[PDB]
Design a protein around this ligand. Structure first.
Ligand SMILES: *C(=O)CCCCCCCCCCCCC
Length: 192
């Protein structure tokens, strides 16, 4: 699903433990990237610009329906490949199309069961998102949460640190689910 030949997403969770999962991916239709240009900044590290350089098959959209019905605030990601690499993982939190956060992390391949795994586990969620989540769950209606969440996106860029080649670029968009329904995601390919 979320993956190329060179690098696949295996698991992605954001959570709080006193464990509640806001979102969870465990491991496609297309969407015109042009639809979502305005959801990200048009500066350097703009989605149009990234997509221009390519390659196009490295670009995905995840739509998350998140569970805000629930501490340590964490993000855990696991990628895997057959090639030994060092990864630069860049997360950009955007609000009204402006970047308000950039988190840049590095992970070296670890050999395990005949493949390379990259484990970025329990990275502490930045305080902007923690304060944001705390406010967001105070809202008395989901329709209000979704309205606020219309203006909030995440762009994750994963590159080969040694070659600077883009391996993965994922745009995240958000709504809230009911706790009855639980978290859900839909992964799409971005095309142009
Ligand atoms: C460091 O804080 C950056 C983290 C980047 C990924 C965070 C994505 C998960 C956030 C969950 C939010 C749920 C509702 C908006």
């Amino acid at each position: 699903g979320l993956g190329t030949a060179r690098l696949q997403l295996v698991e992605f969770s954001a959570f709080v433990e006193p464990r509640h999962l806001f979102v969870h991916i465990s491991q496609l239709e297309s969407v015109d990237v042009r639809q979502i240009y305005d959801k990200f900044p048009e500066k350097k590290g703009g989605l149009r610009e990234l997509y221009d350089r390519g390659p196009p098959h490295a670009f995905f959209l995840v739509k998350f329906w998140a569970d805000l019905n629930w501490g340590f605030y964490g993000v855990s990601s696991q990628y895997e490949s057959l090639e030994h690499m060092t990864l630069t993982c860049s997360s950009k939190v955007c609000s009204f199309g402006k970047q308000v956060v950039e988190k840049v992390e590095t992970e070296r391949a670890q050999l395990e069961d005949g493949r390379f795994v990259y484990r970025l586990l329990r990275s502490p969620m930045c305080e902007y998102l923690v304060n944001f989540l705390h406010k967001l769950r105070q809202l008395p209606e989901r329709y209000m949460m979704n309205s606020v969440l219309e203006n909030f996106t995440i762009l994750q860029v994963v590159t080969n640190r040694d070659t600077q080649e883009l391996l993965l670029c994922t745009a995240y968009v958000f709504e809230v689910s009911t706790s009855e329904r639980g978290a859900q995601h839909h992964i799409y390919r971005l095309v142009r």
